[PDB]
Structures are given as structure tokens and as C-alpha cells.
Write a protein that binds this ligand. Structure first.
Ligand SMILES: NC(=O)c1ccc[n+]([C@@H]2O[C@H](COP(=O)([O-])OP(=O)(O)OC[C@H]3O[C@@H](n4cnc5c(N)ncnc54)[C@H](O)[C@@H]3O)[C@@H](O)[C@H]2O)c1
Ligand SMILES: NC(=O)c1ccc[n+]([C@@H]2O[C@H](COP(=O)([O-])OP(=O)(O)OC[C@H]3O[C@@H](n4cnc5c(N)ncnc54)[C@H](O)[C@@H]3O)[C@@H](O)[C@H]2O)c1
Ligand SMILES: CC(C)CC[C@@H](O)[C@@H](O)C(=O)O
Ligand SMILES: CC(C)CC[C@@H](O)[C@@H](O)C(=O)O
Ligand SMILES: [Mg+2]
Ligand SMILES: [Mg+2]
Ligand SMILES: [Mg+2]
Ligand SMILES: [Mg+2]
Ligand code: NA
Lengths: 340, 343
């Protein structure tokens, strides 16, 4: 059965007198560093010479190169892009990781690939959040959290489990739940969400926009209905709480509910489930891993080209027009990662 | 052309047309409760007209002046018909049309009853659509935070010549002008709204469910599979942040390079031609009257078939997994008690 840790199952006692080195200050690193500090945990940032180094300094952290951070740390969180783990592990982390220290990754991919490996005398774990940084930080400040998966890969000390779960409690994940899941399963599951589900959801939204525009509908209205009004996202986020079919039962007019249930369970041909299986096969059999290693070349040049090209697509041209014309509800984000 | 769109914000609307006027909110459901609460908090005189059911009692519990529909209409300058569309015809014929004052304005929140001829222009009166693009709880939460949701409007009949400023005064009072209120014909609004409900919403959920089913079949932990396809809130957060800054932009901003490379490997390539073809079939059913005939049949027995479909959907593996996940993982929520009581 499942092992799910909440606040009752974790404590900050294991972090008493210990220093955490957050390696990276990106989407995850900034959120971990901010929440650890506000939870009363001694934290240091290790970072290469880029904008994230300057940002960590601007937000009041003790910031050094990665080797120096690791050498002054009891716990090391490797929160940099996965393709970078191998070289940083070999050169900066492994030579400086104290005897009895804990190294944590936030995704299983570098463990599956053998780029991050158990070290004699040291602990190794995965603590993999199921949400990006801004919500982890916003939830933390509101007394809430996002879920995470964890795995104890190597435990020399016999104290790795409570130290990993203490980090999880300090960053807020035990407010939701931290479930035991093998790092190989986390890797394949996580990549599947990114490679099948996220693109399929955006492709469906784009398909709806294209068909409406083809059939003579107002492009601003078409863009608002398929996602830009926030209704489809609100349905999906409220659905996380109460269930997706339940949101329609509770919030839908009878007209809406009758229409929804006419086509619910009937919209997709078998080619969709077949492509999901093909994506999982690419993930499980190393084809994506090889593709990722290639794309990391000249600092992700091909990704830069794909990012720029996507902004020129009709959906994103229409998004810029709608967003300039309709005010979307936002909250001020200035100072979000400064000390609370 | 994009330049042709007529979009009103707060600077283009005022509460002045509502000075000394009473709005009758007919119905106190998903839309009715939000309209009533926001109108009252905006300083607009509001009454609720409702049949004898749980919504009558809720309106009283929430401090409103509540009567049957005919009495509400008889004492109002503006009437908002916020009940299910299939009920518009009988309520219009029996309770509204005979009681609507000279020079009063009737608004619907969906064009379907206008397309079908169940709600019609009345000599000496005004008729309009103000169609919110969001359900009630967000309209209310946004309103209380000084925000709003978009809406479409159409002036169908304007005896007084004052219908536009009165419709937009309602829109400002309920908060839609804080986002934007765009002119769109009631017929277009009808088909567009139905398309969102019959193609896009069920396809998004079917896609989430297909992901869940494939993961469970391939031996993944069902709780984890459920969390990743939506239960974590990540896919919802992606789509809601995407509404702000763009869907491809959320991935560029918030995704690890591993995530962005994976996403861009399959973006624009996941769906076969048959999905597009199905979207066109659903539009054909909506535009040609097939869906209107289906809906009339479904309603004719107080939605008995919908009750069966709602109960059957809760038994699907995705929804069984949802209850297991929800029990075991705490989801961030905000207290909702008293949300619709006076500010
Ligand atoms: N983004 C998310 O929502 C998310 C969620 C869960 C897990 N993760 C995991 O968290 C880890 C960090 O991902 P992220 O999304 O925060 O990444 P990111 O793209 O925000 O990472 C930027 C950070 O990485 C550093 N960096 C980049 N290239 C480097 C290199 N070659 N050597 C050293 N430092 C380098 C930068 O200086 C900066 O500190 C990854 O293992 C990722 O899979 C990400
Ligand atoms: N739900 C939404 O998010 C939403 C959004 C925009 C537009 N609309 C439109 O708003 C209107 C109201 O829809 P809703 O979703 O609030 O409905 P709902 O299902 O919440 O409506 C319940 C209300 O309708 C009343 N009602 C039901 N059957 C009735 C009958 N036969 N006679 C009289 N009153 C009756 C009930 O007493 C109650 O006040 C519709 O035109 C709908 O298309 C709904
Ligand atoms: C809850 C969401 C799917 C509803 C679509 C709504 O905007 C409304 O048009 C309705 O008829 O319910
Ligand atoms: C924003 C969302 C689609 C990203 C998936 C994230 O949880 C993370 O796994 C990543 O690698 O970026
Ligand atoms: Mg992830
Ligand atoms: Mg509707
Ligand atoms: Mg709608
Ligand atoms: Mg990931
Ligand atoms: Na337009």
C-alpha cells in the first residue's frame, strides 16, 4: 500500500545545526531556498556565474560557486537542469560532499542514466515536487503545500529518510503529502506528463481555436473560450480538488451538463492512446534520453528556435491581442522570494 | 479584423444608469447568486425572483428580498433571467412578459433561448444578452479582489435607446468591465459557448483520462498517475497561468530544460486529423438544431438521463482514483462559507 507523509509524519528536528546547500536558484532552487530560510533552516546557494547568482545575492542569500557551497553543507539539493547533473556531480559535488552528507535530486532522470550515483559513506535521495516554483512559494506563504514523491536510493547514515522528509516539511510538501515512489517510475511518469499530456492539452486547445476560426467565429472570442477567459484552467484546477466530472455537475448550467455528457468518453480516436503508448516507449527505452543529450548541444540552440517559432503561431498571435484587450486577474509577485 | 472588436472596460461604463432603479435577479443558481451578491455590494437595489425550491431559502438566508418570479418582475426596472435555458420559454410566457414594465430591460446570459425564439422582443421594452465567460464562484472571488471575468453582450431590442448603457451598468456592477465586455451577436455566442461545452471540455477530460488509463495499464502507481494527469493541480495551474501569459510561454518560463525539450518534441504533433473532424461534427450538431432537439428531449423529464450520466461518471476508474487521492493528499483550498453574504 502507499506510504504518504504529512506534517504529523515529519519534523525539522533533523535539520537542527545543519546547513543546506541549494545548488541552482532557478524555478525549483529559488522556491526551496526561500522556504528553507523562512522555516528557520540554515541555507547557502551554490551557483555558476550567471543571472541566477546575482538574483540569489539580491534576495539576501549567502552565494558562492557550487564546490564551495557543497564543502560547507550537510545536505545538498541539486536543483539544476538534468543534462548538467553528470559534469557538476563528477567535478563539483562528489569531490566535496562531506562524509555522512545527503545529496538530493528533484527528478530521477540523472539516477536512471547513472550520471548521479551513490557515494561510499554518503546518502542519496530523490525529493521530486509535483508543481513548479511560484505555486510552491505562494502555497508555502498561505500555510499550504504541493505534493512530492520521494525515494531513498542510498542510506549510509540510516538517517536519510527523516532528513529528506525534514527538507520536505521545511519547503511545505508534507502540508499536501509526500509519497514514496521509485526514482525510475518518477522519471518515466514525469517525462510522460511533459511529452504526451501537456502538449496534447495545448494541441487540443489550439485545434478548438483553429476549427472555430475556420468556421467564421471571432478570433478573440474563440481564444477566450478555448483557454484565454481562464474558464478551462479554472475547471482543471478546481477539478484537482473535487473531480473533473464533479466540477461540471456543480458549476455547469443544465445546458452545459447535457452537452458535456453527450460527448464525454467519446471524443478521441484510438490513435491518441496509441501515441501515448509510443511516447511512453520512447521514454522507457532511452530514445528520449538520447534526443535530450543531443538537444542540450550548443546550450539548447534547437529549443531556442522552437520557443521563438511557437510565439509566431496563430494561437499566440491571438493571445497577445486578447491579453492587450482583456485584463486578466493577477497578484503582485514583487518580493515573493524575499524573507517573510 | 481585430480593430473592429468593441470591448468595454470600467472607463467605458458607469453605475449612473442604475440610480433609483431595481434589478430583479430571476434565479439564484450558479450565475444568479453571483449577480445578486455583486449588485448588492456595488450599491444597486436588488430583488430575487425564484420558484419554491432550495434556492429560494438560500436567497433568504443570504439576506435578499425574495418572492416568486412574477412579483420580482412586477417591481423591477431591469430583469436578469438566470435560470436554465430550457425553462426560459414557459417562465417568459407566464411570469415575465405579462409583468415586464414599460421601458424595462430583460437580459439573458446565453443566446440559446433567443436563437430558439423562446425569449422574444416585446413592444415598448429592451432585450439584451450579457453572457459571462466564467462560472459563479470565480466571478464572486474576483469581484471581492477588485477583479472580474470577461463577458459578451448584444443589444437585441432597444425601445428606450438606453439599453446599451443599462446592460453595461449591470456589467460594471457585477465586475465584467474590470476584465472586458465585448460586443458579440447572441447567435454566435450560443454556438461558441455550446462548442466549448460539447467539444473542448469533454475532449480535455477525455485526454486527462486517456493519460490516466495508459499509465495504470503500463503498471504505474494509480495515485501518482492521477496526480500527474490533473490531481496535483499542475495541469490546471499551467492552463490558468497560460490564460494570463500564453500556454507555450508558461512552459518556456516554468519548465525545466528537460520538460521544454520533451514538450517541444510533441507540441503540434499529438493529434490525428480525426479530432479536427469530430470538432466540425459537434459544430454541425450545434448550428443545425440537432443539439437543441437533444437538449429539449433531455429536459422534458426533469433531466432524468443527465442524473443517470452524472451518477455513472462517478463510477469511472478516474473518479474512483480521484476519491482515493483526495482522501490521502491535502489540496490547497480557500474557506467558502459566507462568500455571497454582504461585503
Ligand atoms: N521546473 C519545475 O517545475 C520542476 C519541478 C520538479 C522538478 N524539477 C527538477 O528540478 C531541477 C531544477 O530544474 P528547474 O526547472 O529549476 O531548472 P532551471 O532551468 O530553472 O535551472 C536554472 C538553474 O540551473 C543553473 N544551471 C543551468 N545550467 C547549469 C550548468 N550547466 N551547470 C550548473 N548550473 C547550471 C542556473 O544557474 C540556475 O541556478 C531539475 O532536476 C528538474 O527536473 C523541476
Ligand atoms: N453556469 C455558468 O457558469 C453559466 C455561465 C454563463 C451563462 N450561464 C447561463 O446562465 C443562466 C443560468 O444558468 P445557471 O448555470 O446559473 O443555472 P442553475 O442550474 O444554477 O440554475 C438554478 C436556478 O434556476 C432556477 N430554476 C430551475 N429550473 C427552473 C424552472 N423550471 N423555472 C424557474 N426557475 C427554475 C432555480 O430555482 C435556481 O434559482 C442560463 O441561461 C445559463 O446558460 C451559465
Ligand atoms: C463550468 C463550465 C464548464 C461551464 C460553461 C459555462 O461558462 C456556462 O456557459 C454554462 O452553460 O454552464
Ligand atoms: C510546468 C510543468 C508542465 C512542468 C513539469 C514540472 O513539474 C517539472 O517536472 C519540469 O521538469 O519542469
Ligand atoms: Mg514534473
Ligand atoms: Mg453555457
Ligand atoms: Mg459559457
Ligand atoms: Mg520534469
Ligand atoms: Na476579432
Amino acid at each position: 500500500n502507499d506510504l504518504i507523509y504529512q506534517d504529523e509524519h515529519a519534523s525539522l528536528q533533523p535539520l537542527e545545526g545543519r546547513t543546506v546547500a541549494v545548488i541552482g536558484y532557478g524555478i525549483q532552487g529559488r522556491a526551496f531556498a526561500a522556504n528553507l530560510r523562512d522555516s528557520g533552516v540554515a541555507v547557502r546557494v551554490g551557483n555558476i556565474d550567471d543571472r541566477y547568482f546575482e538574483l540569489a545575492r539580491a534576495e539576501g542569500h549567502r552565494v558562492t560557486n557550487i564546490a564551495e557551497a557543497v564543502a560547507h553543507a550537510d545536505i545538498v539539493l541539486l536543483l539544476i537542469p538534468d543534462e548538467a547533473h553528470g559534469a557538476v556531480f563528477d567535478v563539483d559535488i562528489a569531490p566535496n560532499l562531506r562524509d555522512g552528507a545527503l545529496l538530493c535530486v528533484a527528478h530521477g532522470h540523472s539516477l536512471v542514466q547513472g550520471d548521479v550515483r551513490p557515494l561510499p559513506g554518503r546518502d542519496l535521495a530523490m525529493l521530486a515536487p509535483r508543481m513548479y516554483g511560484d505555486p510552491i512559494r505562494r502555497y508555502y506563504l498561505a500555510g499550504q503545500g504541493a505534493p512530492a514523491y520521494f525515494d531513498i536510493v542510498a542510506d549510509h547514515t540510516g538517517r536519510a529518510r527523516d532528513r529528506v522528509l525534514a527538507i520536505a516539511r521545511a519547503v511545505g510538501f508534507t502540508r499536501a503529502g509526500v509519497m514514496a515512489l521509485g526514482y525510475r517510475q518518477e522519471t518515466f511518469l514525469d517525462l510522460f506528463q511533459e511529452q504526451f499530456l501537456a502538449p496534447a492539452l495545448v494541441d487540443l486547445v489550439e485545434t478548438g481555436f483553429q476549427v472555430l476560426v475556420e468556421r467564421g467565429f471571432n478570433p478573440k472570442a474563440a481564444l477566450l473560450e478555448v483557454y484565454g477567459s481562464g474558464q478551462m484552467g479554472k475547471m482543471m484546477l478546481d477539478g484537482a480538488d473535487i473531480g473533473l466530472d464533479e466540477v461540471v455537475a456543480l458549476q455547469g448550467s443544465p445546458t452545459c451538463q447535457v452537452g458535456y455528457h453527450r460527448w464525454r468518453g467519446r471524443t478521441l480516436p484510438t490513435a491518441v492512446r496509441e501515441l501515448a503508448a509510443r511516447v511512453l516507449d520512447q521514454i522507457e527505452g532511452g530514445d528520449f534520453s538520447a534526443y535530450l543529450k543531443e538537444q542540450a548541444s550548443n546550450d539548447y540552440a534547437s529549443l531556442d528556435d522552437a520557443r521563438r517559432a511557437a510565439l509566431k503561431r496563430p494561437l499566440n498571435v491571438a493571445h497577445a491581442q486578447v491579453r492587450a484587450a482583456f485584463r486578466f486577474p493577477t497578484e503582485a509577485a514583487g518580493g515573493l522570494y524575499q524573507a517573510a
